[PDB]
Amino acid sequence: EPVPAIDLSAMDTSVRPQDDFYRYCNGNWMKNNPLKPAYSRYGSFDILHDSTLERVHLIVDNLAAGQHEVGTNEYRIATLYRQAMDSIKRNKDGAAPLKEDLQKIEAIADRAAMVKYAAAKDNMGGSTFFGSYVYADAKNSEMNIFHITQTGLALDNRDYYLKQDAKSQQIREAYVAYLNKIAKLAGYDDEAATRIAKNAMKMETELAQICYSKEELRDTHRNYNKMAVKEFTNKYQGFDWTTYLADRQLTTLEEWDVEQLDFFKKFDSWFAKADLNEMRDYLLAGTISGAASYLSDDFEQARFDFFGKTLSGTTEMHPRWKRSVGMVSSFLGEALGEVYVKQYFPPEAKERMLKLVKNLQTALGERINMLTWMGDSTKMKAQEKLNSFIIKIGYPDKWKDYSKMEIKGDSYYADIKRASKWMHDDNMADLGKTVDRERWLMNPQDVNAYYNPTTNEICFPAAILQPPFFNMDADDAVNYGGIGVVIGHEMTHGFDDQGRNFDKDGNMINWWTAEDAQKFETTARKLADQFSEIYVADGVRANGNMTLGENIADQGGLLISYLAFRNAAKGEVMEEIDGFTPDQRFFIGYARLWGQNIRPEEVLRLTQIDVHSLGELRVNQALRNIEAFYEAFNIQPTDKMYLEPEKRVVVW
Ligand SMILES: [Zn+2]
């Protein structure tokens, strides 16, 4: 049964599109769908996220319906799911599955044993004091190398630990109370629970101080520092890297990528000088917190009170199956994804999507060649890169081998650690081997898409090829406004403030003249400042620097897909549908992707942690730089969407 191209009932026609295009296209849906207790936000995207997750739920119920042999993927999935859903067993076990892990931390006797403990835990997939992983060399994209990265913080953005205003201090104290509660639930007395929470926050705050900001983490060249391992470790011996690497079985490692180099220089003296008891309590708190979703309901409720009620504003938890399905999809996603495509993905969608992608690619080449600010040399290298895109649609051509993953069924938490151990070992085995450029970094059932610089690939999972993005019964204008913009957005990531640094082979090599690079940086700075002047809440501005790459990609996707849409329309009589011109339907279909309600807590949280602008701004601000949108709705200077021409910023 065909799905309507545009859900007209979501539109609020009492709002002029020239004044508030977001609420013209979405306002009635927003009025009629106040957020339910368990949702921090909801709207077009989350509707498709939810409907796809329910498909995966049915797939899990199908695989869990039989009894299978150990060592089959069906057994792995069913056994993780069954244990996650067994509330009675999880509640009877309580904190007992955690006890040996805590005793091992309590037994750490000196700083030397602290180093060996970090290696032992990182060998299981942990990130005890810092991150590490194996992935392509940014300067040799055919080779896998070892990378080390700054501490991962529980609140994500380091600013949570530092910012000096009332709301920030309140959040910090609520986090400490969460640590106190789970320490009590793990069996510590009142005095120890207070001590652990206080010391853990102290230690994590000191690490946050020496971390890079979210903005600085996006700087491509700043966060690549390849060197001989021993050149660094001969000099910085406050943390005993030689013992750590030996216990990681990495003493054969000649070179590595020290991504946040100034973090590790400061970590050298922090680790040498930190109080041993305080470091121990930091480890206890991280271990309890990392287990809080895998034990009894008390632990999940304590975690919900902070990460849900406090940080996101929700008042109830989602049904148990949603978290359980999400968990199996994160560990065995390609096993689920193979079933998903066989059951739900029609072959005609892949063929039509490939035609659309090739149309967008042609339009991007046309757009670049028509630029008047870019010289001929840089244009030619830009054409070489866009002609070299790797295009991945629907699903991979080979499926991941999960045969080494040991799932035993003794306890939920125990099997989570085994699945995590498998993922870690699988990553480590890539070291020193040729990079697999065909691998997917998302699953077919993920409602998302991505660009990868080190492969120059664009990837569109089966799950995003659904309405309102891709609708095989819709008119072309609406599909270009939806999935067409998504395609152009991923393509523009190859040319944003990060992607432009990588060439057609995925190598971090400069292909820009100095003049053209300076013009790009000047214009990108203006787009950052433009968004940074918009308020998202009372006294809270958008972060135009953190969202710069995504706002460039949105703008490029709008410009490229519109050109592709006009190219496809050449030589056709324009026909109005629902009284809208095709040009207008392009923009309405784009804006319908973003309609949502969102709690004020969640507005603040996403501003701190999300590189994507809020849906409202991806419509009402992004379109203010699009000449075609002014033309489609004849926007005039007294209209609220209008931005003075000298203040518009067009990067591509
Ligand atoms: Zn993006």
Which residues, at least 6 apart from 72, have a Cβ–Cβ distance to it below 8 Å? none
Kindly state whether residues 290 and 353 are assigned to the same domain. Answer: no
Distance 143 CA to ligand 1 centre (A): 26
Kindly state whether residues 255 and 360 are assigned to the same domain. Answer: no
In a domain, 636, yes or no: yes
Distance 92 CA to ligand 1 centre (A): 44
CB-neighbour burial class of residue 169 (10 A; exposed 0-12, middle 13-18, buried 19+): exposed
Distance 13 CA to ligand 1 centre (A): 30
Q: How many CB atoms lie within 10 A of CB 553?
A: 26
Kindly state whether residues 279 and 349 are assigned to the same domain. Answer: no
Contact 114, 279 (CB under 8 A): yes
Q: How many domains does the chain have?
A: 2
Distance 544 CA to ligand 1 centre (A): 14
Distance 493 CA to ligand 1 centre (A): 7
Nearest to 633, CA basis, from 646, 619, 652: 619
Distance 42 CA to ligand 1 centre (A): 20
Instruction: Report strand pairing: 390-394 vs 457-461.
Output: parallel
Q: Which domain holds residue 637?
A: 8-34+345-396+438-571+580-647
Structure resolution, Å: 1.8
Distance 611 CA to ligand 1 centre (A): 8
In a domain, 388, yes or no: yes
Distance CA(117)–CA(101), nearest Å, equals 11
Experimental method: X-ray
Distance 496 CA to ligand 1 centre (A): 10
Kindly state whether residues 231 and 123 are assigned to the same domain. Answer: yes
Distance 451 CA to ligand 1 centre (A): 8
In a domain, 459, yes or no: yes
Distance 185 CA to ligand 1 centre (A): 40
Distance CA(605)–CA(174), nearest Å, equals 15
Contact 625, 555 (CB under 8 A): yes
Which residues, at least 6 apart from 650, have a Cβ–Cβ distance to it below 8 Å? 523, 555, 559, 625
Distance 486 CA to ligand 1 centre (A): 9
List, edge to edge, every strand of the sheet that includes 140-149.
131-137, 140-149, 255-258, 226-228
Distance 80 CA to ligand 1 centre (A): 32
- Concatenate the DSSP letters of all residues of 486-520 into one string: HHHHHHHHTTSTTGGGS-TTS-----S-HHHHHHH
Look up residue 343 and give its two tokens: 């059951």
Last residue of a domain, one of 294, 315, 331: 294
Kindly state whether residues 289 and 370 are assigned to the same domain. Answer: no
Distance CA(597)–CA(49), nearest Å, equals 15
Kindly state whether residues 287 and 367 are assigned to the same domain. Answer: no
362-391 per-residue burial string, b: 16 or more CB within 10 A, e: under 16: ebbbebbeeeeebeeebbebbeebbeebee
In a domain, 103, yes or no: no
Last residue of a domain, one of 255, 277, 294: 294
Which residues, at least 6 apart from 643, have a Cβ–Cβ distance to it below 8 Å? 624, 625
Kindly state whether residues 117 and 222 are assigned to the same domain. Answer: yes
What is the end-to-end Cα distance of the chain in Å, rounded?
Answer: 39
In a domain, 351, yes or no: yes
Distance 184 CA to ligand 1 centre (A): 41
Which CATH number goes with the domain that contains 277? Answer: 1.10.1380.10
Distance CA(12)–CA(28), nearest Å, equals 5
To the nearest 10°, report the CA torsion of 329, 334, 338, 343.
20
Distance CA(346)–CA(284), nearest Å, equals 49
Distance 489 CA to ligand 1 centre (A): 6
In a domain, 235, yes or no: yes
Amino acid at 1: E
Which CATH number goes with the domain that contains 507? Answer: 3.40.390.10
Distance 186 CA to ligand 1 centre (A): 40
What is the 3-class SS of 209-245, one letter each residue?
HHCCCHHHHCCCCCCCCEEEHHHHHHHCCCCCHHHHH
Contact 457, 441 (CB under 8 A): no
Kindly state whether residues 266 and 380 are assigned to the same domain. Answer: no
Distance 508 CA to ligand 1 centre (A): 19
Query: For residue 347, what are the CA distances in angstroms to 307, 352, 354, 461?
Result: 40, 9, 11, 13
Helix/strand/coil percent split, the chain, to 5: 55, 10, 35
CA atoms within 13 Å, Cβ hemisphere of 186? 29
- Concatenate the DSSP letters of all residues of 147-184 into one string: EEEPPPPTTSSGGGGT--SHHHHHHHHHHHHHHHHHHH
According to DSSP, residue 33 is labeled: -
Distance 338 CA to ligand 1 centre (A): 26
Distance 492 CA to ligand 1 centre (A): 9
Last residue of a domain, one of 268, 294, 320: 294
Distance 332 CA to ligand 1 centre (A): 25
Cα of 543 vs its chain's centroid, Å: 17
Look up residue 85 and give its two tokens: 């859903």
Kindly state whether residues 496 and 564 are assigned to the same domain. Answer: yes
In a domain, 467, yes or no: yes
Distance 449 CA to ligand 1 centre (A): 8
Distance 241 CA to ligand 1 centre (A): 36
Kindly state whether residues 161 and 247 are assigned to the same domain. Answer: yes
In a domain, 320, yes or no: no
Distance 547 CA to ligand 1 centre (A): 9
Nearest to 213, CA basis, from 267, 170, 263, 173: 263
Contact 648, 559 (CB under 8 A): no
Distance 613 CA to ligand 1 centre (A): 10
Kindly state whether residues 371 and 451 are assigned to the same domain. Answer: yes
Distance 553 CA to ligand 1 centre (A): 6
